[PDB]
């Protein structure tokens, strides 16, 4: 039915001006000597990026998030996590 074994992950980017384009995102990451060895996604208000390794993401975020400004607005990068789901019922054991 509906199942999946955790695996590849991505990073969520917030505070992205409505003028920001995929070209700028790729140019920004590459300009900081941080190439994307995966896929890039640009959403209206945010964007997602695939990181090669955990170390790369942590280093990239620290070098980007809080250290990079786009369109006069500071870009925020963090692990794209949700873990949000309503639960209807107790648990045993």
Swiss-Prot record:
It comes from Homo sapiens (Human). Domains KH3 and KH4 are the major RNA-binding modules, although KH1 and KH2 may also contribute. The contribution to RNA-binding of individual KH domains may be target-specific. KH1 and KH2, and possibly KH3 and KH4, promote the formation of higher ordered protein-RNA complexes, which may be essential for IGF2BP1 cytoplasmic retention. KH domains are required for RNA-dependent homo- and heterooligomerization and for localization to stress granules. RNA-binding factor that recruits target transcripts to cytoplasmic protein-RNA complexes (mRNPs). This transcript 'caging' into mRNPs allows mRNA transport and transient storage. It also modulates the rate and location at which target transcripts encounter the translational apparatus and shields them from endonuclease attacks or microRNA-mediated degradation. Preferentially binds to N6-methyladenosine (m6A)-containing mRNAs and increases their stability. Binds to the 5'-UTR of the insulin-like growth factor 2 (IGF2) mRNAs. Binding is isoform-specific. The modification Phosphoserine is found at residue 17. Can form homooligomers and heterooligomers with IGF2BP1 and IGF2BP3 in an RNA-dependent manner. Interacts with HNRPD. Interacts with IGF2BP1. Interacts with ELAVL1, DHX9, HNRNPU, MATR3 and PABPC1. Interacts with the HOXB-AS3 peptide; the interaction increases MYC stability. Autoantibodies against IGF2BP2 are detected in sera from some patients with hepatocellular carcinoma. This is Insulin-like growth factor 2 mRNA-binding protein 2. The chain holds residues 2 to 81 of 599 of the full protein. Residues 9-82 form the RRM domain. It comes from the Eukaryota. Belongs to the RRM IMP/VICKZ family. It is found in: Nucleus; Cytoplasm; Cytoplasm, P-body; Cytoplasm, Stress granule. Expressed in oocytes, granulosa cells of small and growing follicles, Leydig cells, spermatogonia and semen (at protein level). Expressed in testicular cancer (at protein level). Expressed weakly in heart, placenta, skeletal muscle, bone marrow, colon, kidney, salivary glands, testis and pancreas. Detected in fetal liver, fetal ovary, gonocytes and interstitial cells of the testis.
